[PDB]
Amino acid sequence: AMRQCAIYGKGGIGKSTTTQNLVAALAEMGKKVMIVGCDPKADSTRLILHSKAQNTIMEMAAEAGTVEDLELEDVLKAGYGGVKCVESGGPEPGVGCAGRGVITAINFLEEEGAYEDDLDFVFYDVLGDVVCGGFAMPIRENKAQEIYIVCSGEMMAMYAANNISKGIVKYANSGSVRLGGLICNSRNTDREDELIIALANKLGTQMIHFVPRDNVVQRAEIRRMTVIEYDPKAKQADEYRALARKVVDNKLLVIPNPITMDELEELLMEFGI
Amino acid sequence: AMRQCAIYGKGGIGKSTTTQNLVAALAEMGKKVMIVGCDPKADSTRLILHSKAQNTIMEMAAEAGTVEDLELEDVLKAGYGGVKCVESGGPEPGVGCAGRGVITAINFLEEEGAYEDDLDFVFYDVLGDVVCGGFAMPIRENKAQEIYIVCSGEMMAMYAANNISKGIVKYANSGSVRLGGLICNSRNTDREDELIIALANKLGTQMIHFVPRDNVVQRAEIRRMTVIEYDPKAKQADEYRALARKVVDNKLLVIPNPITMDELEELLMEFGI
Ligand SMILES: Nc1ncnc2c1ncn2[C@@H]1O[C@H](COP(=O)(O)OP(=O)(O)O)[C@@H](O)[C@H]1O
Ligand SMILES: Nc1ncnc2c1ncn2[C@@H]1O[C@H](COP(=O)(O)OP(=O)(O)O)[C@@H](O)[C@H]1O
Ligand SMILES: [Mg+2]
Ligand SMILES: [Mg+2]
């Protein structure tokens, strides 16, 4: 078996930094992991591959003729800890549907046998500002059973978490997609941990980890690495190791309870952020 | 004539706060303005209307039967300074296309004669994390001739500005949609103004104004008002008045020059943010 997890959240909140560092810690632990980038920014694998980014399935299919002319060994690339990496891509802005590459990529990976038994985890890194088209497909089509939402005390980040939760509820009658937890990516504000714990409780889930804001992230990313690889002794490395451990051990997967706008505003008012 | 302007940018960057405060300053100046909300969050008019939010065209059409059973006087609501307000709405998460309500709303407003000659400005407040579907329609279908992008020194906010610019270039052979400027909504970081000026120059536009981060915004919004209405003597009120004046006087509308990821990273590296 393998656990299929998707990391959702608003743009800029820390999905790709958190996912790649979490996955590096899992690989350091001995797990076999694949990352599938589902964000048109297409830089969700650069820290594993030590790269600028990664050429996308959409791009490679266009140069090869069809997606059928691609081989899995041409598209999947291995980096730190043997983590396997692939990027979906998407159409250029103003053209088509921004999420159409996610559908092409996930179907290609399934057909070409990328979901080999020795994998322990697959992580999809998914744009979450809209929940439609290919960005909704991991939920609609039962591709990611465990959704973890990266957020912060920022109202827009919590709004996005509630919006993604509504999409999970909408498809609860089919498949087995569930909310596994919230990950707080700190803005270095007071009581922020308590705020995200309270939001998780209202939704029916948990805060799986509070990730501190730490400048070592920027120093590692300037060098195209995870903190795990760049400085294994860093305090922040131990934070990602704690997050990875709790994801491995997590057994709470729920159909969430989305909240009203009044509840959100009451949370922010109360915690004085 | 009326000037048709759209405010784009990543989620949470300050589109709705900036737009409503800019428009309030325009109304204080004697201009007649309409705001059209084109973001599914649907709170783009609350500070003009002193409201929680505003019921959307999608919602009202569903309760009335069809969009044809709606009258313009039922949908448009006037608030501070006589500013007229309407919200598009959108489908619930996981269902349909998140931008489909924008198409319905703009077509309804055009057909029902909302673009009456005495209007001086229309502002569309548009989600900009993806440029597709209804969110691309103001550009694709020539609805907003003047695009102003709210951003900040945050890499994701500048990436979004570049992405929106690519969509403008894609439709430059038809209609007259142009980039009018960047608005820096400060994160209170050093040389941030210089950073956004440099980005604007690379794209071929200008920084039309640097909006400071000021807690009076939160104090005004807790009371469902613009800063213009809440505290007309505030320093921040004068900032929005300066922004409004420069939008009125702006004559630079360009087909922008999108930049590469290397150029963006060089900007951040250089300005040491
Ligand atoms: N815990 C953290 N501490 C410091 N910087 C962070 C942290 N998490 C994310 N960042 C920075 O935030 C920016 C955006 O993160 P990213 O993972 O690219 O967001 P997303 O993938 O959600 O768009 C990156 O520059 C990243 O280095
Ligand atoms: N200049 C500013 N100073 C202080 N707070 C701001 C400023 N601009 C925006 N905000 C706050 O940022 C948050 C998001 O702004 P908003 O306009 O709702 O973003 P968007 O419409 O782009 O999603 C709001 O809570 C708003 O009060
Ligand atoms: Mg990312
Ligand atoms: Mg808004």
Q: Render A138-205 in DSSP notation, one character per residue.
A: HHHTT--SEEEEEE-SSHHHHHHHHHHHHHHHHTTTSS--EEEEEEEE--S-TTHHHHHHHHHHHHT-
Pairing verdict, β B121-126 and B33-38: parallel
- For residue A77, the cross-strand partners are A85
- As given in the structure block, the two tokens for residue A133 are 């088209």
Mind telling me the catalytic residues of A? 10, 15, 41, 129
Q: How far apart are CA A123 and CA A39, in angstroms?
A: 13
Q: What single-letter amino acid sits at A44? A: S
Atom of ligand 2 nearest to the CA of B39: 21
Nearest to A29 by CA among A80, A76, A77: A80
Query: Residue A148: left if φ>0, alpha if ψ -120 to 50, beta else—which one?
Result: beta
Q: How far apart are CA B26 and CA B243, in angstroms?
A: 10
Smallest CA–CA distance, residue B249 to chain A, in Å, is: 29
Q: How many CB atoms lie within 10 A of CB B242?
A: 15
Asked if A93 lies within 8 A of B11 by C-beta distance, the reply is no
- As given in the structure block, the two tokens for residue B217 are 């915004």
> Reduced to 3 states, what is the DSSP secondary structure of residue A258?
coil
Residue-wise burial string across A33-64, b where 16 or more C-beta atoms lie within 10 A, e elsewhere: bbbbbbbbbbbbbbbbbeeebbbbbbebbeee
Q: Which residues make Cβ contacts (< 8 Å) with residue B218, sequence separation at least 6?
A: none
CB A25 within 8 A of CB A241: yes
- As given in the structure block, the two tokens for residue A142 are 């039962």
Displacement of CA A10 from its chain's centroid (Å)? 11
- Cβ-in-10-Å burial (0-12, 13-18, 19+) of B216 comes to middle
Treating both helix axes as pointing N-terminal to C-terminal, what angle do A261-270 and A155-170 enclose, rounded to 10 degrees?
Answer: 140
Q: How far apart are CA B26 and CA B121, in angstroms?
A: 9
Treating both helix axes as pointing N-terminal to C-terminal, what angle do B235-249 and B15-28 enclose, rounded to 10 degrees?
Answer: 80
Asked if A12 lies within 8 A of B155 by C-beta distance, the reply is yes
Q: What single-letter amino acid sits at A191? A: R
- Cβ-in-10-Å burial (0-12, 13-18, 19+) of B126 comes to buried
- For residue B68, the cross-strand partners are none
> Could you give phi then psi for residue B257, rounded to 5 degrees?
-115, 90
- As given in the structure block, the two tokens for residue A164 are 């993604």
Q: What single-letter amino acid sits at B233? A: K
Asked if A163 lies within 8 A of B133 by C-beta distance, the reply is no
Q: How many residues does chain A have?
A: 273
Q: How far apart are CA A270 and CA B14, in angstroms?
A: 23
Q: How far apart are CA A101 and CA B113, in angstroms?
A: 39
Q: How far apart are CA A166 and CA A125, in angstroms?
A: 19
HEC per residue, chain B: CCEEEEEECCCCCCHHHHHHHHHHHHHHCCCCEEEEEECCCCCCCHHHHCCCCCCCHHHHHHHHCCHHHCCHHHHCEECHHHCEEEECCCCCCCCCCCCHHHHHHHHHHHHCCCCCCCCCEEEEEECCCCCCHHHHHHHHCCCCCEEEEEECCCHHHHHHHHHHHHHHHHCCCCCCCEEEEEEEECCCCCCHHHHHHHHHHHHCCCEEEEECCCCHHHHHHHCCCCHHHHCCCCHHHHHHHHHHHHHHHCCCCECCCCCCHHHHHHHHHHCCC
Q: Which residues make Cβ contacts (< 8 Å) with residue A107, sequence separation at least 6?
A: none
- As given in the structure block, the two tokens for residue B95 are 């269902």
Nearest to A96 by CA among A61, A134, A54: A134
Q: What single-letter amino acid sits at B227? A: V
A31 labeled binding residue? no
Q: What is the DSSP string of A35-97?
A: EEEESTT--TTHHHHTSS----HHHHHHHHSSGGG--HHHH-EE-GGG-EEEE---PPTTSS-
DSSP state, A30?
Answer: T
Q: How far apart are CA A102 and CA A57, in angstroms?
A: 9
- As given in the structure block, the two tokens for residue B78 are 């006037």
Pairing verdict, β A84-87 and A178-185: unpaired
DSSP state, A9?
Answer: -
CB A170 within 8 A of CB A141: no
Q: How far apart are CA A49 and CA A207, in angstroms?
A: 29
Q: Which of A7, A8, A16, A17 to mutate to test the pocket of ligand 1 (most atoms within 8 A of CB)?
A: A17
Experimental technique used? X-ray
Q: Which residues make Cβ contacts (< 8 Å) with residue B238, sequence separation at least 6?
A: none
Residue appearing with tokens 């020059």: B257
| Residues with C-beta less than 6 Å from any ligand 2 atom | A 155-156; B 9, 11-17, 185, 211, 213-214, 217-218, 221
Q: Which residues make Cβ contacts (< 8 Å) with residue B137, sequence separation at least 6?
A: B99, B102, B103, B106, B143
The number of the ligand nearest the C-alpha atom of A212 reads 1
> A139 to chain B: nearest residue by CA?
B94
Q: How many CA atoms lie within 13 A of B173 on its CB side?
A: 1
